Amino acid sequence: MTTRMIILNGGSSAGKSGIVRCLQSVLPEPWLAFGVDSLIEAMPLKMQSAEGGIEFDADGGVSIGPEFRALEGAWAEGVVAMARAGARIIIDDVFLGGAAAQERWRSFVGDLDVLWVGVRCDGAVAEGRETARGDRVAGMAAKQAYVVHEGVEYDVEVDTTHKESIECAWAIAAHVVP
Amino acid sequence: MTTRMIILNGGSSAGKSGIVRCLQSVLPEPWLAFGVDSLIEAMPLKMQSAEGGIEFDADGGVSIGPEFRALEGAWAEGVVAMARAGARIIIDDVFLGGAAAQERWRSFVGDLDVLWVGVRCDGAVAEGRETARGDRVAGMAAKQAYVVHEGVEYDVEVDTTHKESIECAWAIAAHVVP
Amino acid sequence: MTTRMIILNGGSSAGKSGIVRCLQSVLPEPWLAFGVDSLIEAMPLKMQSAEGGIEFDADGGVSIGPEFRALEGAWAEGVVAMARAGARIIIDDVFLGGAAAQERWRSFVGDLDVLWVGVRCDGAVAEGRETARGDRVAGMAAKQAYVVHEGVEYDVEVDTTHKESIECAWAIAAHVVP
Amino acid sequence: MTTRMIILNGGSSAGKSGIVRCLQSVLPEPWLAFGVDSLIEAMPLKMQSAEGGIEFDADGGVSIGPEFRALEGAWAEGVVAMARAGARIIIDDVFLGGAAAQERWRSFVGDLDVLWVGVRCDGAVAEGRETARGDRVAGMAAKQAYVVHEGVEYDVEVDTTHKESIECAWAIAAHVVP
Ligand SMILES: O=C(N[C@H](CO)[C@H](O)c1ccc([N+](=O)[O-])cc1)C(Cl)Cl
Ligand SMILES: O=C(N[C@H](CO)[C@H](O)c1ccc([N+](=O)[O-])cc1)C(Cl)Cl
Ligand SMILES: O=C(N[C@H](CO)[C@H](O)c1ccc([N+](=O)[O-])cc1)C(Cl)Cl
Ligand SMILES: O=C(N[C@H](CO)[C@H](O)c1ccc([N+](=O)[O-])cc1)C(Cl)Cl
Ligand SMILES: O=C(N[C@H](CO)[C@H](O)c1ccc([N+](=O)[O-])cc1)C(Cl)Cl
Ligand SMILES: O=C(N[C@H](CO)[C@H](O)c1ccc([N+](=O)[O-])cc1)C(Cl)Cl
Ligand SMILES: O=C(N[C@H](CO)[C@H](O)c1ccc([N+](=O)[O-])cc1)C(Cl)Cl
Ligand SMILES: O=C(N[C@H](CO)[C@H](O)c1ccc([N+](=O)[O-])cc1)C(Cl)Cl
């Protein structure tokens, strides 16, 4: 029953990265963190200008093509492989495809023990934080705030609308089996 | 009565930068933002290793020497000069010297119309956010949370302990005379 | 004859920022660094989406409107004011307007002692570095490589095409009167 | 004979990251990039303050403990797993242990087709660039410039002392079998 992977899902500006660093500080054993964002940074820059890659609409929409998806797949497998190799992994994701996305993960994970975490946050509030951070495309927060969880099943749910990252971290750590 | 400068004061991780970007988005006229941090980034790197410069204790303490202070002074004058030249300026500061610090500003400002803003936040909560951001020296938040406001007089006060940046932004904008 | 300001001019990716940090390390007295880029970061984000602000064409072109120019002006005056106040200032600029730009500076500077530095670099090579850094809009380097110096007069010229930043730094420092 | 992984080795400031982005732009197929630095960013912050983790001496030295090494191991396996899954991977490493380090990789890689790249650069020059970038601990460049290659065998060697990143990129791409 030892937890091997902690997969978090939430919309942009919902507070995931903040929760991730807190978890890494709180949890006693070292946990590696990776996510759709670190994956993007690891993909070639041109992937962001290629049709079957990832595209950022000016209104904050996000489109994903097969070239991008294909790469992501091998990446996912590698992350699972790290867990298998004995590294405790935290995944900061954004299930744009809702349930479809969670399934995709389930397939790569297999019988590996995973803690599915849901990070919610009022769209309006997320949108406010989006402005405050100033480093995201205005509109992503709102567009993602809800559709991301539709049909997704979690083992734990935190809502950053009125809870600090460190607090949400404590709630999540409590469900982590050593 | 037109506001020329908005000087914010608060401890590390209290939420100032977030409020600043919100203000820049909210306010109709363009406001330039500068602060102790941009000043630091503009000072030579070695200033951070020189005795009369700025020193960061491992426990999160911050010491300021005369070499640093001298530079800061000319900088302050320049910022005031920008206001005088007609640029709307926002200053994100950290009054380590409490009232002493506010006086220092008053001297540079003169009869220029300034909106003194206080950004408060529970030390414990600030410390939590400090961990979540992971890019500050652990301990700064708590050490600064309160001593920074002792003896300081504001025209407006916001407390980020339970208020989003955008909200605090709205409260502050309301006191800005066009 | 003491040098109060060091104004560098060069196209994107020509190597200015690198030379700037070297100068700050080399020069014995503390020099504050500021530039078109720090100014941009200090301007509201929306300035980048407003017509009379600054616009970044997808091919790497850069357009500047009056709203942006107006702000820049007050900023320039403030920087000069810092020099006057006794702070040694380094300005990392990009004379898009060639000679016109240098004149604009001359007007703000007045009789202040300034060291005009020219940072050149082969367009092709600059374009290569542009790719290597991956954090600029492809095409800026080439578009700026030359037009930026047309009609501009320097006291010192360095060419980073075959010279390291630290070397160019040494050449520039040598012309700085204490 | 299709190349699955490109493993680059070089000392800090030798120019690897710059070469990596160029390769990602040059190579026709998408290549994911990862390295000791992205791994560090993915490890908990505290790993940098824990004895068996990674420690940064003030003079630029770097020490690695077993806790850090253990994690790195599972990470290495995961990266190899990504290659196996069909993702083209580029690894930006720093063989502090010289030959010992290359062996460690050979063990994880197995019979996977790998292109071993060596990125050299004169210590003095690397040290100069270290200053110019200003975001590394002074002294790392020099300490690493040479010891890193002792006993290491490459399929290709580039020297950034007098060659631009894009050029070195071209030399390396030429040895990549599709
Ligand atoms: O802005 C970014 N990422 C955010 C999420 O952190 C963006 O909203 C996003 C959402 C989903 C996504 N995906 O699922 O492939 C990619 C980017 C990075 Cl490009 Cl910096
Ligand atoms: O190289 C490109 N495109 C082709 C299709 O025109 C290609 O198959 C591709 C798309 C994205 C990509 N990536 O992320 O590196 C790589 C190759 C464009 Cl990005 Cl210029
Ligand atoms: O960490 C930093 N700054 C914070 C404040 O944002 C630090 O707490 C600090 C506080 C006061 C200060 N001062 O008043 O000179 C300088 C740095 C910068 Cl060095 Cl990145
Ligand atoms: O140059 C240095 N120090 C002397 C005193 O030893 C000097 O007067 C000084 C201190 C800080 C500084 N700065 O911020 O650039 C500049 C010069 C050290 Cl930083 Cl190496
Ligand atoms: O990319 C940027 N700046 C470069 C120069 O460093 C861009 O080429 C540029 C050039 C000139 C300019 N101007 O003169 O107003 C503004 C940006 C910043 Cl937006 Cl990050
Ligand atoms: O606020 C805006 N525009 C008007 C004109 O429609 C305005 O006068 C302005 C433009 C740029 C700007 N800035 O940089 O903050 C401020 C106000 C747009 Cl940026 Cl939404
Ligand atoms: O400074 C850093 N990394 C450089 C290399 O890019 C440092 O020189 C270093 C070298 C070797 C290393 N290792 O082999 O574990 C880790 C960091 C990161 Cl901590 Cl930002
Ligand atoms: O938690 C810590 N240490 C113990 C040993 O005292 C621990 O086993 C450990 C070290 C590094 C680490 N990491 O990278 O997350 C995790 C746990 C210190 Cl970092 Cl406070």
Closest by Cα among A151, A156, A83 to A115: A156
Q: Which chains touch A (3 or more CB pairs under 8 A)?
A: B, D
**What's the number of CA atoms in the CB half-sphere (13 Å) around residue A133?**
20
Q: Which residue has the tokens 């951001």?
A: B133
Give D160's contacts in chain C (Cβ within 8 Å): none
Tokens of D77: 């396996």
Q: Rounded CA gap, C36 and C73, in Å?
A: 11
**Distance of alpha carbon B109 from alpha carbon A97, whole angstroms:** 54
How far apart are alpha carbons C119 and C152 in whole angstroms?
A: 11
What is the rounded CA–CA span in Å between residue C133 and residue C142?
A: 15
Longest dimension (CA), chain C: 44
User: Do A15 and A145 touch, CB atoms closer than 8 A?
Assistant: no
Judge contact between B151 and B144, C-beta under 8 A.
Answer: no
> CA A92, CA A118: separation in Å to the nearest integer?
10
In whole angstroms, what is the distance from residue A30 CA to residue D125 CA?
A: 37
Q: For D90-149, what is the HEC assignment?
A: EEEECCCCCHHHHHHHHHHHCCCCEEEEEEECCHHHHHHHHHHHCCCCCCHHHHHHCCCC
Max CA pair span of chain D:
44
Contacts of D61 by beta carbon, 8 Å cutoff, 6+ apart: D139, D140, D143
Whether B165 contacts B22, CB under 8 Å: yes
Whole-number Å distance, alpha carbon B37 to ligand 3 midpoint, is: 6
Question: Residue A6 is encoded by which pair of tokens?
Answer: 């902690």
Q: Which of helix, strand or coil describes residue B7? A: strand
* CA dist., res. B118 & res. B161, Å (int): 13
Residues of D in Cβ contact (< 8 Å) with C131: 21-22, 25, 165-166
Q: A25 alpha carbon to ligand 8 midpoint, in Å?
A: 9
Deposited resolution, Å: 2.8
Residues flanking ligand 2, CB < 6 Å: A 43-44, 46-47, 49-50, 53, 67; D 30
Q: Is C112 in the pocket of ligand 5 (CB under 6 A)?
A: no
Q: One-letter amino acid identity for D62?
A: V
Which positions ≥6 away from C62 have C-beta within 8 Å? C54, C55, C56, C96, C140, C143
| Mutation to test the A interface, candidates B24, B127, B131, most A Cβ within 10 Å | B131
Alpha helices (H) along A12-116: 16-26, 36-42, 66-84, 99-109
How many domains is chain A partitioned into structurally? 1
Question: What CATH number did the domain enclosing D36 receive?
Answer: 3.40.50.300
Helix (H, G, I), strand (E, B) or coil at C62: strand
Residue D147 has phi, psi (to 5 degrees) of -45, -30
Residue D128 is part of which domain span? 1-178
Q: Does D164 touch chain C (CB under 8 A)?
A: yes
Query: Nearest CB to D164: which of C18, C128, C166?
Result: C128
Give the tokens for residue A177. 């089996």
Taken in order A53, A58, A62, A63, the sign of the CA dihedral is: negative
Q: Does the annotation count C93 as an active-site position?
A: no
Kindly list the residues from chain B whose CB atom is less than 8 angstroms away from the CB atom of residue C54.
none
Is the separation of the CB atoms in B32 and C43 below 8 Å? yes
How many CB contacts within 8 angstroms connect chain B with chain C?
91
